C-alpha cells in the first residue's frame, strides 16, 4: 500500500499532519479534448497565483509554517492547544472555523504594512 503520500495524512492529527506539508505543496501546480484540457490548465495557474499572492501579502512569502503578529481572539475559538494539535484533524478544525475566515486575513493584511512602515522608519535613522 501507499498509505503515506500526498493526502495520506488527512486522517492524522494536526500535529502529525503538519510534518508533511511539502507533499501537498508540490502537486498544486502539476481536437475537442485539447480545448477542454487547455481551459482546465488555465484555471490551475490562476488559483496557484491567487494563493501565492495571498500568502505574500501577509509577509509569509516563501514559508510553509510562518507565524505572525496578530493575537488569537478567544471569541472565535475557546479550545486550547492540548485538545487541538494532537486530538483533532485539520478537516474538523476547518469545518469548525470556516465561518470566521476573512477577519484574520484582513487583520494580517493591515498588520504587515505597519511593520513595513516601522522598518523603514528605523532604517531612516
Amino acid at each position: 500500500a501507499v498509505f503515506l503520500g500526498f493526502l495520506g495524512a488527512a486522517g492524522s492529527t494536526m500535529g502529525a499532519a503538519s510534518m508533511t506539508l511539502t507533499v501537498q505543496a508540490r502537486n498544486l501546480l502539476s481536437t475537442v479534448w485539447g480545448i477542454k484540457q487547455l481551459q482546465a490548465r488555465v484555471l490551475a495557474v490562476e488559483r496557484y497565483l491567487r494563493d501565492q499572492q495571498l500568502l505574500g501579502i501577509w509577509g509569509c512569502s516563501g514559508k510553509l509554517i510562518c507565524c505572525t503578529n496578530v493575537p488569537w481572539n478567544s471569541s472565535w475559538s475557546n479550545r486550547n492547544l492540548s485538545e487541538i494539535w494532537d486530538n483533532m484533524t485539520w478537516l474538523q478544525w476547518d469545518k469548525e472555523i470556516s465561518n470566521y475566515t476573512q477577519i484574520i486575513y484582513g487583520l494580517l493584511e493591515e498588520s504587515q504594512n505597519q511593520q513595513e512602515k516601522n522598518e523603514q522608519d528605523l532604517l531612516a535613522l
Binding site: L21, C66, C67
Partner: peptide
C-alpha cells in the same frame, strides 16, 4: 493563552 494566528500552507483539506 497568549496565542497568535499562524498560517499553514499545504493543509490536507478538500
Amino acid at each position: 493563552e497568549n496565542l497568535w494566528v499562524t498560517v499553514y500552507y499545504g493543509v490536507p483539506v478538500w
